[PDB]
Amino acid sequence: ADSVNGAKIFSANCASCHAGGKNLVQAQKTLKKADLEKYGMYSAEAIIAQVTNGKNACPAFKGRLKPEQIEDVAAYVLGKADADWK
Numbered sequence: 620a621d622s623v624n625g626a627k628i629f630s631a632n633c634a635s636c637h638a639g640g641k642n643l644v645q646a647q648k649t650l651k652k653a654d655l656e657k658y659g660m661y662s663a664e665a666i667i668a669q670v671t672n673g674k675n676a677c678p679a680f681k682g683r684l685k686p687e688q689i690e691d692v693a694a695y696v697l698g699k700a701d702a703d704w705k
């Protein structure tokens with residue numbers, strides 16, 4: 620996984636709803652470490668599955684992003700959650 624490529628994917632695909640690690644559509648479901656842990660989403664496998672397939676109003680990216688790009692953005696988010704958002 621390549622977090623730097625991940626940041627690029629995040630800017631292009633995720634910041635519309637998750638700028639600042641927030642969630643503009645479902646406010647408590649943020650990208651902060653504490654929230655990812657709380658909801659069982661603090662792992663690459665968990666983020667990949669949800670980004671790929673979607674969940675409620677979290678859009679699915681299967682076929683819109685390549686599998687490796689989904690992997691990269693999951694690594695970014697975990698890194699960011701660890702360093703800056705929490």
Ligand code: HEC
Pocket residue numbers: 628629632633634635636637642644645647648649650651654655658660666669670674675676677678680692693696
């Ligand atoms: C709005 C149009 C969104 C875009 C663009 C992306 N996400 Fe999202 N995300 C969105 C919602 C409404 C929710 C909550 C869904 C629910 O009902 O539970 C989510 C949730 C996530 C989560 C889970 C966060 C948590 O605290 O549990 C993750 C990890 C996540 N979203 C990641 C993510 C990525 C990497 C994105 C771009 C590729 C992305 N999301 C786009 C809404 C939207």
